[PDB]
Design a protein around this ligand. Structure first.
Ligand SMILES: COc1ncc(Nc2ncc([C@@H](C)N3CCN(S(C)(=O)=O)CC3)cc2-c2nc(C)nc(N)n2)cc1F
Length: 840
């Protein structure tokens, strides 16, 4: 009974009932649940309860040069508090927490004031992110003396060979049936491995009535022994002049290596090119409205495995050197395959090589597995995330290839997993089976670390709530996570979900009262409902989903309001529930219903990756990739950046509601907000840096052409773009006269700052180009897994151009500087055209 009481709880947290079997035709999901018990238990049993409880967040990356020149001679100050009054201590960057706490005593723990963050463990204090964060923002390091939190609070509650068959594969299409609906229609059946169609066959076209039967056998040209694991039977329905209307898939070799035998009635998905959704094995849960198809397959199990010319070498290195979106010809494929063993010596050749394997040919695949047996150089090579990500995309449906990718991820430190976690979670969509090396890796790295675990929960939950194609798989994975994270995390997750459920309701009802124009009489209505839920049943405190170290407390009803938008998001502000906080600042969260926030998360995360890339080359570009977390179906939270205003408003306040935009206004605003000329120029510099990073970052992603109401700036000079969910003469990015004036330029001039801006942009751009392959992959995956409305080849090939693939550096500078100049030329014309468009 209580075990079922625990399952009800799990289900509430996941947002999907995992025990259900109403939408399966096999036991793969249930088999995967039993399969993940072991790796879960293993990781739960092997994790240090102490370090797990305090989750020290640390890095082994070198302290960047920009954070070095902010330390006054190998010394940092660490203010230690107790009851109220605060003693200060001098420390060197290399002092371990215990060493600093030993210095003080002439057992307790150092906790960061206001946060559930801890400076504990065998690493120097220059190696904690909270310290580097305090350094970057020119801030002081305040910590309390505290008891370690009890590990009892994290306690988890204990608990015929296929290769002897030369028969061609065939499938019987009995017919299709739609419940509701004059043209004709046919069924197309594809044997696929990844994006490759191995063999294709159609039925003959019949009239599209609410029931169409065929009773036809489609013999394929492929032999049953030649079926590779992860082969999908992809059934599609066309009509006409031709158009695809429905699709469904079925793994031909199941999870227990058995060939698929018997009667199936598969409920299909509708269409609204390369969408991750097209690859799913999930059938449509909506039995009542959806099309279905009926088929027949006729105990076969699949067995398991055990000096060139100059011209050709060059030709092979030319191929190996190309980008991931450069299509390989048959000549190139045949070359790579013929020179198999020479290509294996180059890690960079792996994606291309494994794309040259004829996967519908049992002996070739065998030789490929032989080849994978001899992977000494790969195993030895340093971790290349870009290369590793390529092997986890839609082009690779073979487990053994994919496993060598995950093999390399094992060596990622917890800092790096957090950088790539979102996209690793999305790559699960390209896995043929519910149980995968990648799925388990995410499981153990999550269970090993509360911060990875926190974000894994939300990322998974976000997909479970707004994707029917993959919710089943992600629900199995998240169930496995929650069954080992511990009772404390379970309580946190419960609190967080409760709060966001309470806020959703208040949002839906507020949206209903308004005419889409936001009256202040409605802002009284909002304040009423917020007060109503404050006493009961809102919880005393909750972790901020996008910043888990922070606990939000009581609402500041006074400061909450309904924002002037057509989605009417809630601007909310909370007090911090932690009294040891030594600030008054509220915690600002925008709560929005109406849009899928996943796209936003993806761009923001790519921005974080771009930052770290730049850190490798000691460049800081002061981007503000603010917190943004999808929390359920078309709902989520966004962090409110403090002391921030839009560029639009700075114009509107001086100039008025008119497009008569003025060059001087921003610099004036910055001058007025800067109290001192030293703080001013620092703000101006921050702006030159910020502006350069957003110019480069948005060019590469093709999101630089924006209305300046979607660009903001802080009172300390920090420019940042907002609201990426959305997405004539154009512009590569936003570099307007107001920005140029702040730098000391107008019309056709240059300055001390402007040349430095051009300097930073060029070095920023080139630095990204040193990771072309990585960025191309994240961009392809982003499109394929997060943006259904923008997934053609030509959409993906934007980034090839943007990154000037194949060109030398010195030319690529010339390319970027032209873009800077294509802005100069246009001044206000596009911003002005944005005013005409959006305001009217
Ligand atoms: C993905 O959806 C969103 N993404 C980002 C934001 N953030 C912001 N959106 C709009 C604004 C400006 C234009 N806003 C207009 C309305 N007024 S009002 C009179 O309704 O209160 C407030 C200012 C600002 C933000 C924003 N975003 C962040 C991250 N920080 C700050 N400070 N602001 C809001 C979203 F709904």
């Amino acid at each position: 009974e209580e075990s079922q009481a625990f399952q009800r709880q799990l289900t509430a947290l996941i947002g999907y009932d995992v025990t259900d079997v109403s939408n399966v035709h096999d036991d793969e999901l249930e088999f995967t649940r039993r399969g993940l018990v072991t790796p879960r238990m293993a990781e739960v049993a092997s994790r240090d309860p102490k370090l797990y409880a305090m989750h020290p967040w640390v890095t082994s990356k070198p302290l960047p040069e920009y954070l070095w020149k902010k330390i006054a001679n190998n010394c940092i100050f660490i203010v230690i508090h107790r009851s109220t009054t605060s003693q200060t201590i001098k420390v060197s960057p290399d002092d371990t927490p215990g060493a600093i706490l030993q210095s003080f005593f002439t057992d307790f723990v150092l906790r960061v004031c206001g946060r559930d963050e801890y400076l504990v463990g065998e690493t120097p204090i220059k190696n904690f992110q909270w310290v580097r964060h305090c350094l970057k923002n020119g801030e002081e390091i305040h910590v309390v003396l505290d008891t370690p939190p009890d590990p009892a609070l994290d306690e988890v509650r204990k608990e015929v060979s296929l290769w002897d068959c030369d028969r061609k594969f065939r499938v019987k299409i009995r017919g299709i049936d739609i419940p509701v609906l004059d043209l004709t229609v046919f069924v197309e059946a594809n044997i696929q491995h990844g994006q490759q169609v191995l063999c294709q066959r159609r039925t003959s076209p019949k009239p599209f009535t609410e029931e169409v039967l065929w009773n036809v056998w489609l013999e394929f040209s492929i032999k049953i022994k030649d079926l590779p694991k992860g082969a999908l039977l992809n059934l599609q329905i066309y009509c006409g002049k031709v158009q695809l209307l429905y699709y469904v898939n079925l793994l031909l070799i199941d999870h227990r290596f058995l060939l698929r035998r018997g009667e199936y009635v598969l409920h299909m998905w509708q269409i609204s090119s390369f969408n991750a959704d097209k690859l799913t094995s999930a059938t449509n849960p909506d039995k009542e409205n959806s099309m279905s198809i009926s088929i027949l397959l006729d105990p076969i199990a699949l067995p398991k495995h055990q000096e060139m010319p100059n011209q050709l070498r060059k030709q092979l290195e030319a191929i190996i050197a190309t980008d991931p979106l450069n299509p390989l010809t048959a000549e190139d494929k045949e070359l790579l395959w013929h020179f198999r063993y020479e290509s294996l010596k180059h890690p960079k050749a792996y994606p291309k090589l494994f794309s040259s394997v004829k996967w519908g040919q049992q002996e070739i695949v065998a030789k490929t597995y032989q080849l994978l047996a001899r992977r000494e150089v790969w195993d030895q090579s340093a971790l290349d995330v870009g290369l590793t990500m390529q092997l986890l995309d839609c082009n690779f449906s073979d487990e053994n290839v994919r496993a060598i990718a995950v093999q390399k991820l094992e060596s990622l430190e917890d800092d790096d997993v957090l950088h790539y976690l979102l996209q690793l979670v999305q790559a699960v969509k390209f896995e043929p089976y519910h149980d995968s090396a990648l799925a388990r890796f995410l499981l153990k790295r999550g269970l090993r670390n509360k911060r990875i675990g926190h974000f894994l929960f939300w990322f998974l939950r976000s997909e479970i709530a707004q994707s029917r194609h993959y919710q089943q798989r992600f629900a199995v994975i998240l169930e496995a996570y929650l069954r080992g994270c511990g009772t404390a995390m379970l309580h946190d997750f419960t609190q967080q979900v409760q709060v966001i459920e309470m806020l959703q309701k208040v949002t839906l009802d507020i949206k209903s009262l308004s005419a889409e124009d936001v009256s202040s009489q409605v802002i009284s209505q909002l304040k009423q409902k917020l007060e109503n839920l404050q006493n009961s049943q809102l919880p005393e405190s909750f972790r901020v989903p996008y910043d888990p170290g922070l606990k939000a407390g009581a609402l500041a009803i006074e400061k909450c309001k309904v924002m002037a938008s057509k989605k009417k998001p809630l601007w909310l502000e909370f007090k911090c529930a932690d009294p040891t906080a030594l600030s008054n600042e509220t915690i600002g969260i925008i709560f929005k219903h109406g849009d899928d926030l996943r796209q936003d998360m993806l761009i923001l995360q790519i921005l974080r990756i771009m930052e770290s890339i730049w850190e490798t080359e000691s460049l800081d570009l002061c981007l503000l990739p603010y917190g943004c977390i999808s929390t359920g179906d078309k709902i989520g939270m966004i962090e409110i950046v403090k002391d921030a205003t839009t560029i639009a408003k700075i114009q509107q306040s001086t100039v008025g509601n008119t497009g008569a935009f003025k060059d001087e206004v921003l610099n004036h605003w910055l001058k007025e907000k800067s109290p001192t000329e030293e703080k001013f120029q620092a703000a101006v510099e921050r702006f030159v840096y910020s502006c350069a990073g957003y110019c480069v970052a948005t060019f590469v992603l093709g999101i630089g052409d924006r209305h300046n109401d979607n660009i903001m700036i802080t009172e300390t000079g920090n420019l940042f773009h907002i609201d990426f969910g959305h997405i004539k003469e154009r512009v590569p990015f936003v570099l307007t006269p107001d920005f140029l004036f702040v730098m000391g330029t107008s019309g056709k001039k240059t300055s001390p700052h402007f040349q430095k801006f051009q300097d930073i942009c060029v070095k920023a751009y080139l630095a990204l180009r040193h990771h072309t392959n990585l960025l191309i992959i994240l961009f392809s995956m982003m499109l394929m897994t997060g943006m259904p409305q923008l997934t053609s080849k030509e959409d993906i090939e934007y980034i090839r151009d943007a990154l000037t693939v194949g060109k030398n550096e010195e030319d690529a500078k010339k390319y970027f500087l032209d873009q800077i100049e294509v802005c100069r030329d246009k001044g206000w014309t596009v911003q002005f055209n944005w005013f005409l468009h959006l305001v009217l």
